[PDB]
Amino acid sequence: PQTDPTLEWFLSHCHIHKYPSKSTLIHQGEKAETLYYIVKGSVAVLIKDEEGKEMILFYLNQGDFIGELGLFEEGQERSAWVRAKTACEVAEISYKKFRQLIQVNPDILMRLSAQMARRLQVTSEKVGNLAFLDVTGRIAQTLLNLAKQPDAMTHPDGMQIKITRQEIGQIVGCSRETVGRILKMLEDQNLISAHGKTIVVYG
Amino acid sequence: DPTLEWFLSHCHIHKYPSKSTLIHQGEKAETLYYIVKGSVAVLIKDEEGKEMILFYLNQGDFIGELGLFEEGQERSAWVRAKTACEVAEISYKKFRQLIQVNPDILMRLSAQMARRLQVTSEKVGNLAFLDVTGRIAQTLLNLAKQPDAMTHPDGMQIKITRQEIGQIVGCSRETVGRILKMLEDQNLISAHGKTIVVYG
Ligand SMILES: Nc1ncnc2c1ncn2[C@@H]1O[C@@H]2COP(=O)(O)O[C@H]2[C@H]1O
Numbered sequence: 314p315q316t317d318p319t320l321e322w323f324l325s326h327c328h329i330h331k332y333p334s335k336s337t338l339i340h341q342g343e344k345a346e347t348l349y350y351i352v353k354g355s356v357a358v359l360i361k362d363e364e365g366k367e368m369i370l371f372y373l374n375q376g377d378f379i380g381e382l383g384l385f386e387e388g389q390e391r392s393a394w395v396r397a398k399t400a401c402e403v404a405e406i407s408y409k410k411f412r413q414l415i416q417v418n419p420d421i422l423m424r425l426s427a428q429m430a431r432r433l434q435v436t437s438e439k440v441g442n443l444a445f446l447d448v449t450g451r452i453a454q455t456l457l458n459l460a461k462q463p464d465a466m467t468h469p470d471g472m473q474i475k476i477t478r479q480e481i482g483q484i485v486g487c488s489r490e491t492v493g494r495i496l497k498m499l500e501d502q503n504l505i506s507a508h509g510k511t512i513v514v515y516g
Numbered sequence: 517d518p519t520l521e522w523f524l525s526h527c528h529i530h531k532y533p534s535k536s537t538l539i540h541q542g543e544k545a546e547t548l549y550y551i552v553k554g555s556v557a558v559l560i561k562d563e564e565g566k567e568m569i570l571f572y573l574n575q576g577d578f579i580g581e582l583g584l585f586e587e588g589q590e591r592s593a594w595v596r597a598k599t600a601c602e603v604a605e606i607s608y609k610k611f612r613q614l615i616q617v618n619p620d621i622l623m624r625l626s627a628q629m630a631r632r633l634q635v636t637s638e639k640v641g642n643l644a645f646l647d648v649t650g651r652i653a654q655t656l657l658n659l660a661k662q663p664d665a666m667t668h669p670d671g672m673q674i675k676i677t678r679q680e681i682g683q684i685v686g687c688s689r690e691t692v693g694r695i696l697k698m699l700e701d702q703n704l705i706s707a708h709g710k711t712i713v714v715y716g
Pocket residue numbers: 339345358370371378379380381382383390391392393394395432433436633634637
């Protein structure tokens with residue numbers, strides 16, 4: 314973690330709310346009139362198809378803004394669901410009040426925009442993965458990213474992560490069954506080791 | 517627009533012919549662009565150079581903005597002129613000084629980023645939830661819903677090459693041809709050649 318006076322100034326204008334793990338902070342389709350900032354915890358951003366299947370777009374963490382995409386034009390709806398992945402503490406402020414703060418000190422918009430730019434780079438890559446990789450390479454690539462997250466744990470034969478079939482499937486666009494068939498196949502290829510819901514990525 | 521014209525007076529403007537590349541993926545990102553006239557395609561490529569289009573940008577669109585907020589970044593995509601273009605250009609350093617003078621110029625840029633993230637997220641959803649055949653069907657349906665789709669007795673009529681479809685959905689013009697034929701055999705469309713009729 315890390316803070317500064319510009320962020321504490323901003324936080325003093327917000328209200329703080331707690332969200333237990335698995336609770337939904339933002340429902341797709343709601344009117345977007347408020348901005349969030351994660352003081353503690355992590356959330357998943359996700360979207361759905363007509364049949365209720367879920368895709369994860371991003372994981373956001375402490376220091377991440379959320380609900381920013383409606384800020385620049387009135388009348389918009391929330392573009393995705395946002396669900397607490399762990400217990401969360403989340404600052405919230407109306408768009409109107411945030412715009413007044415932007416007038417006082419534009420650096421607070423700089424910080425928000427830097428996160429938007431980063432999310433657009435990552436989401437564009439995600440488009441390239443989904444377009445150009447098959448499920449297997451999507452899965453292989455997903456495991457590689459995690460293997461280089463700050464959450465990784467050292468290990469003798471490589472780098473180690475934990476994740477469920479279901480979460481993998483939600484990331485890549487497939488069933489937990491396809492994930493299992495593919496994990497097994499990667500294991501037979503001596504690329505990974507799986508131990509329940511814990512995965513050693515070799516290399 | 518005063519802000520626009522103030523901003524433009526700090527840029528150098530240059531003309532680019534159709535099909536020229538304004539931005540190459542991997543280059544160091546140190547400058548911001550703004551489209552004064554024309555349209556461009558933003559694209560990505562697989563390892564074999566098969567193309568996917570991420571977005572079409574037009575007059576009034578910023579480009580090359582994604583490196584602005586941290587130094588040392590590379591261009592995340594290629595940007596190619598789709599028509600002849602006139603494009604304002606300015607260094608990130610000079611743009612940051614303008615942001616200090618008047619933050620509204622950052623508001624405008626951020627509004628376009630937010631819109632691009634909403635649209636690109638919808639595209640992630642389509643790619644995750646639809647196969648190549650469903651992506652092509654959905655593309656034709658969406659095109660048939662645009663203001664420029666023409667009325668046809670059997671449905672709507674659109675104009676778009678196999679290559680453009682392939683660029684939209686992430687496949688070769690060959691894969692596009694086979695699926696269009698399949699969709700035609702399924703009595704869903706007619707690919708007259710001079711036109712696609714989307715029935716219904
Ligand atoms: N592609 C994405 N990357 C990161 N965060 C996203 C993405 N799409 C949506 N979100 C977040 O999901 C939020 C839900 O509603 P908003 O659209 O107001 O603001 C959104 C963003 O904070």
